[PDB]
Symmetry: C3
C-alpha cells in the first residue's frame, strides 16, 4: 500500500543526498519529500542552532500540511527526527532511524562519540575559525564511503559540505520524544563506520537507545550505498517504514 | 550424507512452527521429527513445568528409539535440548542451538533477558491471572517478525499461542549438560531481535555460553524466515548439523 | 592495476593464497605470495618473529618492490606490522584480513582468551619439538566451520604444525603505531578462529588500528580463500584500492 516518506539528511550532506534513493522509492509508488533545513544546502548560517533546524523542518511539514507519514533520519538527522517528532507527533505514522544517532535525554550528538572522535571534532570546529567542521577527505574516504571507489568517493565528497558545529554539541531535552508511543525502526548497514563499530557503533549501541524498535539490516556504508544501490535502499526503507 | 533431525520449538509456538522447513529438509533426503511437548499444542496445562516438558521429549525419543540424531532447538527450545541431552546423551550426534537460549547452570530462560524485558514478562504473567504470557502484537510484530509484512505478521501472530509461564522462570540444573562431550553448533540469523541485540543478544552472548561450537550465520528473524524461506533454512540447518 | 604482497598466517604456507592470488591476477593485479622463515620448505621449529620478519623484508628488498599493498591473514597481521615498520617508504596501504593486530609490547598469544592461551602453551609443551598441532575437532568447527567434513579433512592436511616461538614473543610496534600509511581491515562474518565476542577479530582486533577502512564479507578463517576465491579477490581490491 502507498507510503509517504519525509527524509531528513544528516551532517556533511544536503537534501540531494536522497536524489537516487528518493527516485527509486517514487518508482515503487511512494510519495517522498526531501526537505532542506537551516544552515544546510543553500542556507548559509554557520551559527545555526538545533532549534532553528527543527523549526525549518516543522515549518516545511506544516506548510504542506503532511499527515500519516514515515519520518526517516540519517546520521545527525536522527536527532532532528527526535526533536521534530516532539512538535508534530500527531502527524507521524512511524519514525525510522537509518544509521542515525539517537541521543538520550540531556545528551548531544557529540556525546555519542568515543573520546578520540569527540576530540577530533572539537579540533576541526576550532581549526575553522568560523564554527564549522570540514571532514578531512582521507577520513571521509575510509570511514564514510569505505565501500566506494576513489572516483565515487571524490564525487560524493563534492556533495559533503562543511557542517555548522553548534547543533552537534547542544544538549537536547528529549523527555517528550522518549514518552511518545509512535513506533520506531532502525535501518542499519553493516559496513557503516562513520562512528567506529564497537561499543559506540550505530548498532547495537545507538539503536538500543530506542528501546523497542523494528530492526532492518542491509549491506552498505554511511554515504556510498544511497547513491550506488538506490533500488535496494528504497526496498529496505519500505521494510523499515511499512506497517 | 542423510541426517536425522529432532526439532524442538520454543515458546509462543507449537510443533507446526517447523511445517515448511521440515518439509524442505525431507526433500533433501533427511529424516525429521517435530515432537509436541507438555503444555503446548493441544496439551492444556498452564501449570506445566520444565521437568514435565523435558520428560515428554525424552519419552518421545525413547518410544521411537531414536538415535544418532541432530537435536535442534529454537528459542526456549534451547533450554529443552540442554535438559533432554542430560538424560539421553548416548543418542545424540550433535546439538544445534538455532536462535536459542543456552542458560548456564543455575539460571532460567527469563534470566537471559535485559532487566526491562524480564520485568515486562513478569508483568504479563501476573496480568494473565492464569500463569500465561501473551505477547502483545506490537512487540511481536516489531521484534519477533520484524522482516515480515503486516499481513504475514498477523498470520504468524494467530499461530503464537499464550505461553505457560513456569518453565521460563525455573532455575535449571545444567551441570551434566556442561560436562557433555557432544559437538555443538549455533545457527544465528542476523535480524533476530526476539531478545534485543547487544550485551544480552543471541550471538555472541547466548552462543558464547556453549564454549567451543560451530557457528553458522544466515539472514532472517525469529519467526518469519522458517515460514517464508524454508529451503534456505533447511540448507542452513544441514550446514549446522552435518559432520 | 595494484600490486599486492600477501602474508599467510599460522598452520599455513604461501600456498594458502594459490586460488585467491590466481583470481587477483585475472583482475589485472600483480600478486606476490612469499614464503617466510620456518614455514613451507624451511624446517625450523625454533624460528623467531625477527627471523620471519627479516625473511619478508629481504624478499621485498631483493625484488625492489614498491608502492604495494601489504596484506596479512591471521598471525600474518603481526608480520605486516613488523615488516611495515622496516620498509614504510615502499608501502601504499596495509590490509589486515581476519588478522591479529597486537598493541605495542604484546604478542599474538596475548590476543587469545585465557583458556586458549593455556591450551596453546600445553600443545607447545606436549609436542616435545616447540610446535603446535591444532586438534582436528577444534580446527573443523572453529577454523573451517563453513566447510564440509571432506573439505575440512583436505584443508587440515594442508595445515602443518606451527613453530611456537613467534606466537608468544612480545613485539616492539612503536614505529608501526606512529605510521601514517593507511590501514584497512577485511573481516569475514563467520570467522571464529578466535571466538566472536570480546576477543573477536572485529571489532576487537580491528579497533587496535585506530582509523581504518572496514570491508566486510561472508566466510570463515580458512575455507573461503579456497572455495570463493573470486569473491575474496574482489574484497581484497575493495580493501586495498586507493
Amino acid at each position: 500500500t502507498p507510503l509517504t516518506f519525509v527524509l531528513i539528511h544528516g551532517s556533511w550532506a544536503t537534501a540531494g543526498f536522497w536524489d537516487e534513493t528518493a527516485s527509486e522509492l517514487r518508482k515503487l509508488g511512494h510519495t517522498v519529500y526531501t526537505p532542506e533545513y537551516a544552515g544546510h544546502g543553500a542556507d548559509k548560517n554557520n551559527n545555526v542552532t538545533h532549534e532553528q533546524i527543527t523549526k525549518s523542518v516543522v515549518d516545511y511539514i506544516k506548510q504542506k500540511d503532511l499527515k500519516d507519514f514515515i519520518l526517516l533520519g540519517h546520521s545527525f538527522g536522527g536527532s532532528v527526527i527526535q526533536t521534530v517528532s516532539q512538535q508534530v507527533p500527531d502527524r507521524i505514522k512511524r519514525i525510522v532511524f537509518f544509521d542515525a544517532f539517537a541521543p538520550l535525554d540531556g545528551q548531544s550528538v557529540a556525546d555519542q562519540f568515543p573520546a578520540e572522535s569527540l576530540k577530533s571534532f572539537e579540533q576541526l570546529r576550532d581549526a575553522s575559525g568560523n564554527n564549522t567542521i570540514t571532514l578531512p577527505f582521507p577520513l571521509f574516504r575510509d570511514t564514510f564511503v569505505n565501500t566506494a571507489s576513489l572516483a565515487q568517493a571524490q564525487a560524493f565528497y563534492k556533495q559533503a559540505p562543511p557542517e555548522p558545529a553548534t547543533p552537534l554539541f547542544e544538549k537536547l531535552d528529549l523527555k517528550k520524544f522518549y514518552s511518545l508511543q509512535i513506533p520506531k525502526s532502525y535501518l542499519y548497514l553493516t559496513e557503516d563506520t562513520a562512528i567506529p563499530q564497537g561499543p559506540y557503533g550505530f548498532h547495537p549501541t545507538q539503536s538500543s537507545h530506542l528501546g523497542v524498535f523494528r530492526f532492518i539490516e542491509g549491506k552498505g556504508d554511511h554515504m556510498t550505498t544511497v547513491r550506488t544501490e538506490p533500488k535496494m535502499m528504497a526496498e529496505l526503507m519500505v521494510k523499515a517504514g511499512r506497517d
